[PDB]
Amino acid sequence: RDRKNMPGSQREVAHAEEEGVEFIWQAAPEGFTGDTVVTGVRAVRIHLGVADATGRQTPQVIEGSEFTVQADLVIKALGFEPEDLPNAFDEPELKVTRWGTLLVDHRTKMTNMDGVFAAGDIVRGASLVVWAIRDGRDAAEGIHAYAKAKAEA
Amino acid sequence: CGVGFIAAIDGKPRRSVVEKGIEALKAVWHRGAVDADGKTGDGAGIHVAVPQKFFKDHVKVIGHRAPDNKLAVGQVFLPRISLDAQEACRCIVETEILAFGYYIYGWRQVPINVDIIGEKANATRPEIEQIIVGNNKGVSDEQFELDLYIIRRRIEKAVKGEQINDFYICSLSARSIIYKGMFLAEQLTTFYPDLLDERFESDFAIYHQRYSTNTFPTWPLAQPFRMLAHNGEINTVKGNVNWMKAHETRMEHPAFGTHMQDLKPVIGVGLSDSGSLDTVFEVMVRAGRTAPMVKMMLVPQALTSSQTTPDNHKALIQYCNSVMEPWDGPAALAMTDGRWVVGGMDRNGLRPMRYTITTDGLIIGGSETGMVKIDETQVIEKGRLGPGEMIAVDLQSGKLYRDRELKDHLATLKPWDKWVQNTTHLDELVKTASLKGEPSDMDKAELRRRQQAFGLTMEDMELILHPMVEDGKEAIGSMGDDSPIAVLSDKYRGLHHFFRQNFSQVTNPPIDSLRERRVMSLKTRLGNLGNILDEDETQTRLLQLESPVLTTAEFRAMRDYMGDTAAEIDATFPVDGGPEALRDALRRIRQETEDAVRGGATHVILTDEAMGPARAAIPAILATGAVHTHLIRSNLRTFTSLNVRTAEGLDTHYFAVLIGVGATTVNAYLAQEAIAERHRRGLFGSMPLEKGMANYKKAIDDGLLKIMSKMGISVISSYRGGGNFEAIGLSRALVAEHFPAMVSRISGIGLNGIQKKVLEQHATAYNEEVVALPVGGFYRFRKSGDRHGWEGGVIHTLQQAVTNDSYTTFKKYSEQVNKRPPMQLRDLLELRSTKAPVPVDEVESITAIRKRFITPGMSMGALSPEAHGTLNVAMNRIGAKSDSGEGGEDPARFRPDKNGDNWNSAIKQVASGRFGVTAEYLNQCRELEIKVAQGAKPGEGGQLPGFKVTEMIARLRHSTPGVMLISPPPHHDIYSIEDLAQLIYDLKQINPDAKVTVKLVSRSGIGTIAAGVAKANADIILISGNSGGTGASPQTSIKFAGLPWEMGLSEVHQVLTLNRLRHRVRLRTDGGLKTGRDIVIAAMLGAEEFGIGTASLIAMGCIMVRQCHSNTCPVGVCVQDDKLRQKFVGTPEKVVNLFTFLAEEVREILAGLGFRSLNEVIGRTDLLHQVSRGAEHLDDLDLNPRLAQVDPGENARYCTLQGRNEVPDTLDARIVADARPLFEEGEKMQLAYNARNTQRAIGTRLSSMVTRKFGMFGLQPGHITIRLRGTAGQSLGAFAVQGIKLEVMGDANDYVGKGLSGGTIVVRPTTSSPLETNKNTIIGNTVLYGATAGKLFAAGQAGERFAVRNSGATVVVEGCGSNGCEYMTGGTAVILGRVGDNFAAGMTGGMAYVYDLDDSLPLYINDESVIFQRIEVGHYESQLKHLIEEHVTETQSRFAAEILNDWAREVTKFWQVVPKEMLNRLEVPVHL
Amino acid sequence: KNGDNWNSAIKQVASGRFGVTAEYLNQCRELEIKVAQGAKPGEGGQLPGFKVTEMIARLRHSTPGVMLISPPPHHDIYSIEDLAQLIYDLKQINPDAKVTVKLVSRSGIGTIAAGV
């Protein structure tokens, strides 16, 4: 993608550029050339269309521009997805959406079955730390309310 | 006026369809003709499906039992006056329906409301009833419809048997019904309240409203008809009825059976064109075909010789063109089979048709894009219909077929490829024809003796034949026709002189033959006719020729191919036969032809080579007419052909009339003999004989195309045998007996006079020794030749009288003029009153008469600046009006000079080219004028030679210095009478003070057209004659086109008095006025103002040199050179003296008769008597048809009202009420309103105010801006000036940005629309017609003829249609999409950029005057960059933004189109 | 020159009479008498001492760098005959403009509006 759409911060890119990094914007990996260990990365160059009526750009690969960069150690930093919780927690009744982040109500942050709560990073995605703190405090309030309503009756 | 249709795609009935149809009919009241009564309309109709539940409930209520199968209902118009003819009609209907076996349920009286019809549409109102027929036999539905059709046909025949009038059957079916009448468009659901019921639900609906040209409505003439609805007019109706009469004698189909005998006269009597086309359409549909196939066969597509279409479609169109003759004319059709619903266009695409698809499975098509109200968030695709396209809906399957998909689905039924290959061509046979057997050319003596027998002079070969062989194009003349008419001459005038050509007035546009040539064909087919109701291979086996004219070698090859199947007929009569030898010869040949055709012959060759010293040659026209008519009336024409070998054909007018009378092919061998004999003497130079013959045939073909194009007929097949001419000087009996369908208003010489002329000329040729042909004077004056209107002594006497200022010399001139033998129609008339003479000093003053004369328009291109200025100074001095003609005028003369002269012109013209029409040129006059046709050349554009266009005229017309300028024959703005009404509305909005004048040319049938344009709020009609001068025009159009003004004026006066419309308009005439006697006669016939023209030029020095086109006029009248313009000797005093003498003569005549004013004599026809030339000429001319005196009534016989005819007020009024601080202080404003398609000329009156206040360029760009939301109407912002910015959210209908003069128009889709901007039509037809400056940014696709006659505007659109940038003259235009065929036709100025992806521009462009390349200079890339950036900024598009984003890779996709004439004139060259 | 017109159509006659001249009243289409503002009724508009630059000081005919606090009353309108007299004066000085009275919502505004 382009520079102004980096999902992180903007001072970090300036610091990295000052420390000695070379960036290559709008490039997608196509293949790895080598024999037993990687020796280079053959990549292409994509082109971004204009923003649609909703706010999303469509990329298209340029057929002519293809290059190869010399690489001795490649590091994949694609992303992260949730794990298979219902099949790893012996409770296959957890309500779970497509991506894997389980579903909770907005007020009490309670999962499908009563008593079990879940809030934090497994609910949002690739969120930040302050979002996690907020989710944790909300889950704490909800757990306290539920525990009181339980212990009374 | 307007037609439209609505259809549910899935094919399920619902009330919304009928509701939307009624809503759409409720909103077309602005294109129709208003009336002072308010209740009188001229027609309306709707066509829907049968609501079975309604009629079944009615039948249950009566007491019967509702059947299971579908019920049938018929609607009938019975007589209303007599209560007995109703019973006879009912008896006939009931005894015919019960003859097949069906069960009749009963009759029902349709409830109506008569309180809303006018006074004239109510006196002829019929009694409306319905009959209910049920299918008890259990037969199928298709057989039910066939039986109902046969029943209706036989009922019509029966009721026509007993001569009962006012009977009609609007519909008889079990599927659809028609509600039509002569009420207003919006008052339909009030007259017929049944449609307000909740049970009327259908799955399709059609609606139509018309615009009549007379005021006598007849209910059975309103549309829609049974299975059709037509908007426009058909050109070839007199030619198609004949071929239908010929086809009827062989067609048969096993579906009808014996009842086929009751279907023989398929085209009834008393119908219109859209009724005849409908009848043939229905009889073709009922026999097995479907609506798309019948549409393809009747109104085909343009068989272009390009590779842009697959050859499957090519084979299909080839078969369809070979099977049937086309039905031409402007036409938008919305037809419906029992199953399909089709909407289609004609070959040229002159009428508009726009459609819209919604998400509810609904398609809505019509003439405007805002008739029904639809929210923008529910449309799927907007579109249009190109020329020849069509769009269909299949209801039985529920599918929507667009153009190409329908073509592909239709090209899969029959293997057309294996069928088409049965044809054979001719050039192959001419090649395999070995170059042996060339006969010997005739001897010089024989050639001369054969040429003298027809009256061919030496100027016929040195003036009109040498250019043909030399260059390949017809000659050019430079002055009007002043020769006597054919019947009043004394020399030998051939029979082809008595036939004048025809043309098309406002009701019908001509066709440009120089640019739109790709849609005109000259194919010919021998052995073509057959059964048109089968599908086999024998229908496509024939001989095919590429031109109806043939040389001698080609004719010999064709004869060898024909062999022993042809029959040669002699066409000579004995010179010693007697007084009735010609009649006996005609009978002999017309009997031998029938005897030979029945004997198995399939080719008739009419040769007259047997002409000798004892046998004269029958005129070929009369012979071929007799033979063709006899073959038509004997049911034999469909078997054979008719080839003619004539010895008189020399020019392109003879072949025209021979082919129009009915001949198939024409071979002229004497012209070829003369060509060969002139070549062997070494006159052409070095070109071979084959080159001469090729050039001659090319000239003949182009002349035929030009002659056939003056009417709108674009195919030779539908023009032959139609008789598109007018006979002047021939007997009524002879014309009605030998010629198929022509009018001869006044009678003429019979057969005896023709025999006398022929025999006398033959004796002169064969009884004396000829040594050389006579010199002959027909185009130029010679002492030996005929007489002329302008001779030497006349001219010199007039000039001396005008220079020396002596009334006696002018009286001598007038006497010399009025003492010659008769030469025109007004010479056989005589004035004779019965009162007593009055003293001369009592008649009106000379001033009050001089203020009735004007001078007609003479363009500054033809005249010199000095002569134009002199005429304008002279006329503005005495108080009368002048005219500027086409070509604009100089703005610097918009003020009186220091001495007191006024070099302006009180009447501005609006020509076809829109040559100088701006917003200030229209606000500096007192009367506007719409030139439809000129006196000399009708149905054709004015010409201007290349060298005549100097730098001054180039700047004056905004063109390229030194290039030929030919106006387009049509207007591109007047395609029907409603278009003329719209243009008159525009012209009355731009100038709130002027009067609109319409200029016509006399012919047959001009009365109805004049009565039509009188309802369009025009107040002055101009009837030009056939003898009007010109600056440049061909000879065939000068001598053989038009009619004397005495016929046209006398017909228009009567027709206007008959419709109670004469008291509203003023009549004006011109053409051939020389003395005061002619003025008094024209005033008696009905005219009120008079045009002089040529005589004025003679007062200033013109001596009839007739070299105006060559730019070397000696006296310097019509020249643009300097050293010749130094020889001008004109003076305004001369013109003043001429007009003074002319007025004094009229005063003298009026005093001699006994009246005291020109008002007392206007219309008084009884003061004119006819006197015969004598008892030795024996011409049976009866002028009584023009002497008929209709009684006016209580109104006067002339205009009795002051001021112009006012028009309803548009939106602009409100705007003028709001933008007051702009006119009082001059401050920026900003307004917003709502636009609707019933609001025409949005922003034109404001333009007039701004032009009058600040001028065309007084305000900065964007001083006042208006924001409209919705569908704007027609003529959006016409004639807007700089400082006005209209911004439309939605779409505009038509004529957007017409005559733009510096303003700004922005059109973009709404924000809440899910539509791709580059895939939906946003504007309509004829965009930026003749603009001179400004900008226009649209965010969609344009329509048809995009940016025609552009001169200074810069436009950016995301698409186009056919014939884009036609005849563009200046400015830049960017097109971000595909284009149509014939792109940049006749372009001669400017530049174009096209964003082409599929690499298809070389297939669509017309590479004749332009070159297309890739962009190579950065100076030209910066222009495109800035243009697209401004487009993105103004319209906020997304496609253009995407293009601008990827600039480096998309700059290599643009094609740059540059004219050929601007390759060495640009500052920065386009090459490296 | 661009057509922009910076003038105003409604002039105010406040309690301070800071710019009311014989020309300031002949350049409008409607006059206005401000009796009380909506935010602070029964009080005069304020302006801090440093908000009065040289332009505002020369335009209001005051001293640069001085806190301006308008008098809560008008010293002209003590009762309703006084307001009638003021309206008469305003309609006399300008023969084409109208006069509006700006009030504030409270109880008893009905009788006061009927009196105005």
Ligand SMILES: Cc1cc2nc3c(=O)[nH]c(=O)nc-3n(C[C@H](O)[C@H](O)[C@H](O)COP(=O)(O)O)c2cc1C
């Ligand atoms: C040199 C010349 C130029 C003309 N130009 C025009 C023209 O531009 N537009 C037009 O409507 N008629 C034009 N006319 C025709 C005249 O307007 C008028 O119809 C004609 O001269 C009448 O013929 P008359 O003078 O014999 O009576 C022209 C005629 C001549 C001789």
Ligand code: F3S
């Ligand atoms: S007829 Fe024409 S060529 Fe000259 S002399 Fe008269 S302007």
